[PDB]
Amino acid sequence: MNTVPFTSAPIEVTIGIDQYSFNVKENQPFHGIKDIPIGHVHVIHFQHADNSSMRYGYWFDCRMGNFYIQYDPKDGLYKMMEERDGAKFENIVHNFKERQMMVSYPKIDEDDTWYNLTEFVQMDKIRKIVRKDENQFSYVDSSMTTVQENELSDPAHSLNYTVINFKSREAIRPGHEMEDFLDKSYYLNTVMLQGIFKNSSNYFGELQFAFLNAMFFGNYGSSLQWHAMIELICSSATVPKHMLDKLDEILYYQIKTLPEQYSDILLNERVWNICLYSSFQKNSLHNTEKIMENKYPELL
Amino acid sequence: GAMNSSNYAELFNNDIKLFVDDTNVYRVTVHKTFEGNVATKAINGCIFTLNPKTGHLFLKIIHTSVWAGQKRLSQLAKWKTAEEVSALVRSLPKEEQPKQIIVTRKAMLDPLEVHMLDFPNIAIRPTELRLPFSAAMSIDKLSDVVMKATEPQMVLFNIYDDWLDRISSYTAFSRLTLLLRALKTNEESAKMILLSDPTITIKSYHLWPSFTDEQWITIESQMRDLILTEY
Numbered sequence: 001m002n003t004v005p006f007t008s009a010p011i012e013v014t015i016g017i018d019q020y021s022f023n024v025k026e027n028q029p030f031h032g033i034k035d036i037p038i039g040h041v042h043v044i045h046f047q048h049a050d051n052s053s054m055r056y057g058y059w060f061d062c063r064m065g066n067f068y069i070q071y072d073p074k075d076g077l078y079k080m081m082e083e084r085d086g087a088k089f090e091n092i093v094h095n096f097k098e099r100q101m102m103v104s105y106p107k108i109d110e111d112d113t114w115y116n117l118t119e120f121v122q123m124d125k126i127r128k129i130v131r132k133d134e135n136q137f138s139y140v141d142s143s144m145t146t147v148q149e150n151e152l153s154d155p156a157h158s159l160n161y162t163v164i165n166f167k168s169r170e171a172i173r174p175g176h177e178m179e180d181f182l183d184k185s186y187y188l189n190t191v192m193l194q195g196i197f198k199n200s201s202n203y204f205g206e207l208q209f210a211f212l213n214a215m216f217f218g219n220y221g222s223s224l225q226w227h228a229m230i231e232l233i234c235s236s237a238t239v240p241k242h243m244l245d246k247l248d249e250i251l252y253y254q255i256k257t258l259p260e261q262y263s264d265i266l267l268n269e270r271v272w273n274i275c276l277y278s279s280f281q282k283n284s285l286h287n288t289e290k291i292m293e294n295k296y297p298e299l300l
Numbered sequence: 301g302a303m304n305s306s307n308y309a310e311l312f313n314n315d316i317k318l319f320v321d322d323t324n325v326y327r328v329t330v331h332k333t334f335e336g337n338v339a340t341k342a343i344n345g346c347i348f349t350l351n352p353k354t355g356h357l358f359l360k361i362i363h364t365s366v367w368a369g370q371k372r373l374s375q376l377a378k379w380k381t382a383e384e385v386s387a388l389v390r391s392l393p394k395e396e397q398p399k400q401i402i403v404t405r406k407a408m409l410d411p412l413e414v415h416m417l418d419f420p421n422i423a424i425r426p427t428e429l430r431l432p433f434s435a436a437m438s439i440d441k442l443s444d445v446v447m448k449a450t451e452p453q454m455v456l457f458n459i460y461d462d463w464l465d466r467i468s469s470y471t472a473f474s475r476l477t478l479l480l481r482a483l484k485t486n487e488e489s490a491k492m493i494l495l496s497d498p499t500i501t502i503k504s505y506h507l508w509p510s511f512t513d514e515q516w517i518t519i520e521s522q523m524r525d526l527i528l529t530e531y
């Protein structure tokens with residue numbers, strides 16, 4: 001079980017750790033988060049009390065280094081840093097644990113939610129979507145735009161999601177215009193799966209990362225990417241049975257975790273109604289359709 | 301964006317553009333079977349592709365053989381339309397290709413856009429106008445060449461005859477749309493108006509009678525009245 005210590009908490013802030021969150025008051029004696037489960041990526045986001053509008057945060061994996069948070073009064077935010085001196089880190093953590101100034105990652109034993117939301121998400125793929133190679137962790141905020149958004153303006157601060165565009169030469173084979181536009185299987189299975197992602201695990205990992213970014217940071221471009229990747233599968237007549245079964249599980253847990261009142265600005269009516277009721281896969285997502293109908297019947 | 305009442309003179313500027321109407325591409329008669337069920341029988345159709353500035357009409361005749369063995373024909377018809385329009389553009393020299401294609405029905409937008417991906421600088425536009433191009437099969441010579449066709453065929457016409465020798469494109473298009481709106485609202489009446497006087501003839505190389513300027517004003521005047529009466 002790993003730890004992310006905090007140097008201090010100089011400004012009042014709501015701190016999230018994966019799907020959990022807690023309020024820290026200005027100059028409260030908060031020195032970080034302990035008992036973080038090993039084996040999964042994690043995210044630590046922040047929402048300033050004096051700026052409700054913005055959330056910014058860090059994706060990380062404690063197997064890749066010792067990380068801490070330190071407020072920077074010049075740039076005005078909590079920054080993740082790496083401590084390279086392992087003995088200095090162990091000593092800091094042990095002292096803070098001894099004085100009981102850390103919150104415990106509050107995982108219920110029966111609870112598989114975080115695993116189910118991050119099953120295919122890997123730090124190394126996050127770092128190719130969020131390019132900042134001098135750090136082992138990745139910063140994301142509510143305002144970062146995606147590469148495809150920029151095409152339609154700072155490239156260093158972009159989310160480099162895989163570009164999906166249903167009316168593009170990549171998507172449409174010359175001479176199969178109607179066939180490829182109404183049945184996207186060749187774009188899914190050959191162009192994206194075999195060509196770009198290599199396997200369905202990487203596809204699902206980017207889909208899951210996009211959702212998490214979309215829900216946790218309220219990032220609009222990430223929400224576009226999540227829906228696009230769902231729609232590409234649902235609009236394909238020919239999808240491996242294992243992918244459909246896994247997709248149903250993936251979406252089930254995303255819909256289960258979504259805040260009920262943050263759903264109207266996040267869920268795209270057209271995509272969901274197409275996917276659940278018109279698409280080739282209208283009959284293949286039983287768990288997702290049942291939770292959608294019981295939790296958001298209005299959208300449908 | 302959409303073509304409408306407000307940006308109407310754009311049709312007659314010097315940027316090449318084409319209207320595409322797909323209404324008459326897939327045409328059927330509906331009949332009873334011996335068992336008392338209903339079936340359709342396709343008849344030849346056409347794509348109506350028109351330069352509104354010059355009057356040039358590219359009438360691609362759609363022979364019923366193109367539907368043989370195919371399903372979801374109304375959907376296929378829109379993609380066939382977009383395939384044929386794309387092939388037409390590719391056959392034209394670069395300096396003759398359109399800068400815009402305006403589709404008369406919104407359901408043609410995605411099929412045409414996908415077929416024209418090779419032509420990113422050709423704008424595909426809808427319209428808010430309720431244009432009467434479906435009535436083109438009420439023009440006798442056009443209906444005649446479509447029904448007689450035994451194979452796919454492209455036939456070229458000027459739907460303005462020689463009018464542009466005497467009137468502007470704007471006026472020509474207005475006359476065309478008026479005649480077609482009339483033929484659509486009451487084909488029998490409209491046609492009576494046009495041929496009532498036997499001394500006015502249709503030249504072999506024309507679609508409409510050889511009215512003088514004064515006779516066109518009379519003609520245009522009953523047609524606007526035929527339209528008011530039907531409404």
Ligand SMILES: CNC(=O)CNc1ccccc1C(=O)NC
Nearest residue numbers: 052053054055214215217218262
């Ligand atoms: C995913 N939709 C959302 O509204 C996420 N929610 C936030 C995201 C960024 C900043 C603030 C909030 C918030 O507390 N309420 C909206």
